[PDB]
Amino acid sequence: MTFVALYDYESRTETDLSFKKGERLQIVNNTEGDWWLAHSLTTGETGYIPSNYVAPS
Amino acid sequence: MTFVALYDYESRTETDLSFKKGERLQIVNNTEGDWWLAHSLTTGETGYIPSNYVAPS
C-alpha cells in the first residue's frame, strides 16, 4: 500500500518521479503493470518494458 | 526467464524499449529493481519509481 523512500532519487526522464529520502509514496494502479529492464533477443535492443504486454515463453 | 511480446509497443521516453508483437525478450537484472507508478503523499507529484529505493511503511 504505502511505502517510504530510503534514498534520494533524481528524475532522468519525463515520466519518472523525483523524491527525497523519507517521502511517503503510494502505488498507483495502471494498465501497463510494473516495468522491467529487458533485452530483445529479436532486435538486440534493450530498455524498460511494461510487464502486462508480455507473457512467459 | 524469457518472455514473448503480446502487443506492439512504441517508446515514449529515451529509456523504454520499442517492440513488436512476437519478439522474444529476456529480463535484465539491475540494481534499481522493477519500476512502479507511484504518487507522493509528501509532494503530490506522480511518476515511476525504482522499487529498490523504497520500503513498506
Numbering used by the authors:
A (entry chain A), B (entry chain A): 84 to 140
Study authors write:
The non-receptor c-Src tyrosine kinase participates in different signaling processes by phosphorylation of tyrosine residues in a variety of proteins, modifying their properties, such as enzymatic activity, subcellular localization and stability. The c-Src tyrosine kinase is made up of six functional regions: (i) a N-terminal fatty acid-acylation domain, (ii) a unique domain, (iii) a Src homology 3 (SH3) domain, (iv) a Src homology 2 (SH2) domain, (v) a catalytic domain, and (vi) a C-terminal regulatory domain. Of all those, the SH3 domain plays a key role in the regulation of the tyrosine kinase activity through the recognition of an intramolecular Proline Rich Motif (PRM) and, additionally, through the interaction with other PRMs present in other proteins. To better understand the mechanism of 3D-domain swapping formation in c-Src-SH3 domain, and its plausible implication in amyloid fibril formation, we have solved the crystallographic structures of the WT and three mutants at position 128 of the c-Src-SH3 domain.
All the crystals of the dimeric form of the c-Src-SH3 domain belong to the hexagonal space group P6522 and show a single chain of the c-Src-SH3 domain. The intertwined dimer is generated by symmetry, and the structural motifs of the SH3 domain are formed by two polypeptide chains: residues (N-terminal)–111 from chain A and residues 117–(C-terminal) from the chain belonging to a symmetry mate (thereafter, chain B in the intertwined dimer structure). 3D-domain swapping of the polypeptide chains occurs as a result of an open-like conformation of the n-Src loop (Asn112-Gly116) which acts as a hinge loop. The same arrangement is found in the Q128ED. At the distal loop and diverging β-turn, the hydrogen-bond pattern of the dimeric structures resembles that found at chain A of WTM and Q128EM: the residue at the position 128 is linked to Glu106 through the W1–W2–W3 water molecules network. Besides, in all the dimeric structures, the hydrogen-bond between Glu106A and Ser123B side-chains (or Glu106B and Ser123A) is conserved with an average distance of 2.8 Å. All the intertwined dimer structures described at this work show the presence of a PEG molecule at the interface of the two chains forming the dimer. Whereas the WT did not show a large pH-dependence of the Tm, our results confirm that: (i) the mutation of Gln128 to arginine or lysine, which bears a positive charge, results in the stabilization of the c-Src-SH3 domain, since these species unfold at higher temperature than the WT; and (ii) mutation to glutamate, which bears a negative charge, results in the destabilization of the c-Src-SH3 domain.
